[PDB]
A = this chain, B = another copy of it.
Amino acid sequence: FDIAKYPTLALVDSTQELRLLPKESLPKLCDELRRYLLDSVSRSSGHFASGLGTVELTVALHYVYNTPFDQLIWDVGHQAYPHKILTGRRDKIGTIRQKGGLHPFPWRGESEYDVLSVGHSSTSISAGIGIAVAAEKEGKNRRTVCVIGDGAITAGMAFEAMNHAGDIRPDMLVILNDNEPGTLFEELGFNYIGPVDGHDVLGLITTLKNMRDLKGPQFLHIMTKKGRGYEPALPSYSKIFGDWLCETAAKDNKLMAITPAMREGSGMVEFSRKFPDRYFDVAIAEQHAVTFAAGLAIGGYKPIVAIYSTFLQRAYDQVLHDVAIQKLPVLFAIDRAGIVGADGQTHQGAFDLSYLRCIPEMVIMTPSDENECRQMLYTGYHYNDGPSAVRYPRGNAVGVELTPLEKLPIGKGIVKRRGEKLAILNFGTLMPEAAKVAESLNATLVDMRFVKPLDEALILEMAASHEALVTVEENAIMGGAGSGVNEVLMAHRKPVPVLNIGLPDFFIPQGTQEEMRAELGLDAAGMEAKIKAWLA
């Protein structure tokens, strides 16, 4: 790279080299690393911003700790760009977030300097304790350290971890990256130090050096500048939801909406401002969000849990045990359903149509466009026999016309086109492509609307009038909606070939949503090819 523009950064290709530089040279390095971050990564990545706040902390860590031998763990990892830059990926940083480029967050297979693959938050301390325990048994003096944000240390996990750490007392350092006190951490069993200036590299080095050597659970609380923030993980469906939320809240006082620290992402900013008394941000606590909704439901209100498909994974037990078993009519507005894009593997809303389907009493809806979305939220909100869910992708609507809200009959699909030989059953926002395939193959097209309960009569009807069925969904094929269709046919002993089109059995790689959907054969062309190969 521009060796003359960054004379000091140039002297670092590995942390080993970095540890060779003299202390007084570090402040200058930090300046070059900060400028380099702003000059090489596409601003379209947003996370470069979160990285800015850890520049000094990262240099201090790799200078004091013996990495990659010592184990460094970043929570979430959206703040690890400088970490990647200082660990042999300086000249590859410009490709981060892109298809075939560096991972959006630390990834174990990408580098020996990445100890834990992260994306969801609050996992650092737990894995960290496991790592420190192994290091202690190893007996080679391997050191452990975790960097966790003020927001991430909000999850129950973090508490379970810290409480456990407080008991077995492993030699490890937990660094609180506070960019928004210590009594709690001391009560939990940690030796607390801070708050400290997180942008004083030399000050952090001498502090880190001392604590790296101390025994037992150590906790350093630092403060970093938050900056202007970053973008969260035809109107978007998030805005559709938000708008519906506001208008519904104005109609009746029973609406209560909850988010686990994703107000903006789920499109609830305007809502939270106009109805502060109907809004709840439980912090990064998906588990409490759901059971809190149960309580509200029990108390006679109508709770709505706004949660991403990927994060809803952490509240599975509350959904099933605290809401489903009790038939509590909680409405789940699941955003980021399907492939989410740049965030990659750790954030795909690839499994909700499966893990939710095996749950008794659960009603699962999948809108094909923004009007259907509104109608289903409406239906879900007025469905009081149990829990209901409406899932939608990250992205813009199709631009359809919006009709007056009307409850949709539960478990009923609707044929959109009458064809021959082939009947394509669509579940979700992949409809536009499915529509192209049907028109191109003169096949029958059905918008299933409900994943559960399934419109069995309609399935049986399509099977009886066609040679083969094709199911389309943006979710894992295994256990998903198509799988549900197969189950119905098998039960009635009407074995009609069914091609289940959906997500393959591997975690979906990062890239553009369009770019990744095409690569997986989830577009008109790709789908027709699959059908061709299958029939062949």
Interface string of A342-357 (1 = CB under 8 A from B): 0001100001001101
Q: Assuming A354-B355, A505-B360, is B159 touching A295 (CB within 8 A)? A: no
Q: Assuming A477-B487, A486-B486, is B157 touching A291 (CB within 8 A)? A: yes
Copies, count: 2
Residues A283 and B487 in contact, CB atoms below 8 Å apart:
no
Q: Assuming A296-B130, A499-B490, is B123 touching A318 (CB within 8 A)? A: yes
Cα A346 to Cα B360 with chains together (Å)? 13
Cα A295 to Cα B115 with chains together (Å)? 9
Tell me, rounded to whole Å, the shortest Cβ–Cβ distance linking A314 to chain B. 4
Interface residue stretch chosen among A35-43, A132-140, A520-528: A132-140
Residues A117 and B535 in contact, CB atoms below 8 Å apart:
no
User: Could you say which residues of chain B place their CB within 8 Å of the CB of A119?
Assistant: 321, 325
Closest to A299 in B: B134
Q: Does A383 contact B (CB under 8 A)?
A: no
Q: Assuming A160-B288, A187-B184, is B321 touching A317 (CB within 8 A)? A: no
Cα A476 to Cα B483 with chains together (Å)? 13
Q: Does A506 contact B (CB under 8 A)?
A: yes
Residues A291 and B126 in contact, CB atoms below 8 Å apart:
yes
Q: Does A13 contact B (CB under 8 A)?
A: no
Known contacts A164-B283, A313-B321, then 11 further A-B pairs from the complex at CB < 8 Å, ordered by chain A residue: A116-B322, A160-B287, A160-B288, A358-B480, A478-B484, A479-B479, A479-B483, A486-B486, A490-B499, A491-B499, A494-B497
Q: Sorted from nearest, which 4 A-B pairs have the closest CB atoms?
A: A130-B295, A156-B156, A134-B299, A160-B285
CB-defined A-B contacts under 8 Å, sample of 20: A71-B298, A123-B318, A123-B322, A126-B287, A126-B288, A126-B322, A127-B295, A131-B295, A133-B256, A133-B296, A160-B282, A160-B283, A164-B292, A354-B358, A483-B487, A490-B500, A491-B500, A493-B497, A493-B499, A495-B498
